[PDB]
Amino acid sequence: PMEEEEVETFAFQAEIAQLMSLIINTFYSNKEIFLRELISNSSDALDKIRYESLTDPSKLDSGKELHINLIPNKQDRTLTIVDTGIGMTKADLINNLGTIAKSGTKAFMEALQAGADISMIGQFGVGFYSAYLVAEKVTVITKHNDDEQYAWESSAGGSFTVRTDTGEPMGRGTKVILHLKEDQTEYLEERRIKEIVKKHSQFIGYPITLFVEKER
Ligand SMILES: Nc1ncnc2c1ncn2[C@@H]1O[C@H](COP(=O)(O)OP(=O)(O)NP(=O)(O)O)[C@@H](O)[C@H]1O
Ligand SMILES: [Mg+2]
Known part of the structure; x- marks a missing residue:
């Protein structure tokens, strides 16, 4: 029996779109800091559910372990960052990953134009978009307590989509799937992933x- 699934397509807020275009179409050295940014987001999400669970322990019914997994796939050219943090509701995805203006966007594009290292992106409140230094397409699957599991995706170009995810259930948390550009396959190698975690993510307060x- 054919299934029916609803999709909703959204426009990025205009300066977020301009930053994405700047990230994708300009050369940056030091692209490895994307991983730091994504791990920081996972650590932040883990802090949220850890503190929530102190006032309501049933918030860990969807899984007690608080951790980060990294999953390179050399066959399909993806690098996946999974956490068991708080996750995002549908409304969180939409608001937090692309529709709401961020106050630091303009400052950051000025800084980059003036020659700042792309590593500075975290400072500006827009760290997630460092994913597009290495990925042509990003898929975010997320499950928050008391919302269903959703998939956000964007190949940039000004739009992203949100749909209810009918893929493998996660109990709670977020998976960010980077579909790597062909020249960024170094980030599938275990040595290189170890190197950059040791360089940039060595004080995260959850196991990776x-x-x-x-x-093969
Ligand atoms: N793994 C995740 N789990 C839950 N929410 C997430 C996750 N990754 C991103 N988010 C949300 O997406 C928002 C945007 O992330 P991001 O662009 O990194 O900015 P930020 O983390 O708020 N600040 P910063 O990265 O320090 O510049 C976050 O504030 C969260 O609400
Ligand atoms: Mg961040």
Whole structure:
């Protein structure tokens, strides 16, 4: 029986779109800091559910372990960052990953134009879009307590989509799937992922596990 699924397509807020275009169409050295930014987001989401669970322990019914997993896939060219943090409601996805203006966007594009290192992006409140230094397409699957599981996706170009996810259930948290550009496949190698976690993410207060598919 054919299934029916609803999709909604949204426009990025105009300066977020301009920043995405700037990130994608300009050369930056130091692209490896995307991983730091995504791990920081996962750590922030883990802090949220940790503190929520102190006032309501049933918020951990959807899984007690608080951790971050990194999953490179050399066959389909994706790098996946999974956490068991708070997750995002449908409204959170829409608001927080693209529709609401961020006050630091303009400042950051001025800084980049003046020659700032792309590493400065976190300072400006727009760290997630560092994913587009290395990824042509990003898919965010997320499950928050008392909302359903949703998938956000964008290949930039000014729009993103949100749909209810009918894929593999996660109990609670967020998975960010980077579909890597062809020249950024270094970030599938275990050595390189270890190097950059050690460089940039060594004081995160939750365990990180790197899962490496047996070499083919
Ligand atoms: N893994 C995640 N779990 C839950 N929410 C997330 C996750 N990643 C991103 N978000 C949300 O997306 C928003 C935008 O993230 P981001 O662009 O990194 O900015 P920020 O983390 O708020 N500040 P910063 O990265 O320090 O510049 C966050 O504030 C969260 O609400
Ligand atoms: Mg961030």
